[PDB]
């Protein structure tokens, strides 16, 4: 565990992450993808062996061994809104499972079914919300990785409220 767990946010690339393992925002198939899954697939595309997994699941391959979870959130152009967030928050669950399976002491994450999987809404709320649900009973340092500077603001002001 850290000394001391918390949360931090970063504004920069996840494929540059500084903890001890990435959670890439997957498709089911494990495929290189758009946005954040695309940086992951260069930075680490061993990892990409066999990490085919359901919406609402967590598969980890090791590259190297450098952990990546493959965290699979739901596309809210194709599910309700209703079974949509069922699957988004059940992707952290699994994603904390894996965390604590691991036995590091700090993560990586992006928000999940935000960017091409939002169905064209601002999920920044509901995303983190449900990534704090599942994280908070772990003791991981989690540094979230977003690219916005106004979305920087807003989860550095989400994390701080909680202090
Ligand atoms: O997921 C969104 C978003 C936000 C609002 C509306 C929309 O259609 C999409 N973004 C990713 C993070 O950077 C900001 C944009
Ligand atoms: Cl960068
Ligand atoms: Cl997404
Ligand atoms: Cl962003």
Redesign the pocket.
């Known amino acids: 565990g850290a000394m001391a767990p918390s949360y931090r946010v970063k504004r920069m690339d996840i494929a540059k992450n500084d903890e001890e393992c990435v959670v890439n925002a997957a498709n089911p198939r494990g495929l290189p993808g758009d946005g954040v899954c695309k940086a992951v697939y260069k930075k680490w595309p061993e990892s990409f062996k066999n990490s085919a997994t359901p919406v609402g699941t967590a598969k980890t391959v090791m590259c190297g061994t450098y952990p990546v979870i493959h965290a699979v959130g739901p596309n809210f152009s194709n599910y309700t809104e209703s079974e949509g967030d069922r699957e988004l928050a059940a992707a952290y669950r699994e994603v904390a499972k894996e965390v604590t399976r691991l036995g590091v002491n700090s993560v990586a994450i992006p928000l999940l079914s935000?960017?091409v999987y939002?169905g064209?809404?601002?999920?920044l709320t509901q995303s983190l919300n449900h990534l704090f649900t599942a994280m908070d009973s772990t003791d991981a340092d989690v540094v979230i990785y977003?690219?916005?500077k106004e979305?920087e603001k807003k989860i550095s002001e989400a994390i701080q409220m909680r202090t």
């Open positions: 935000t960017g939002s064209g809404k601002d999920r977003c690219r916005d979305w």
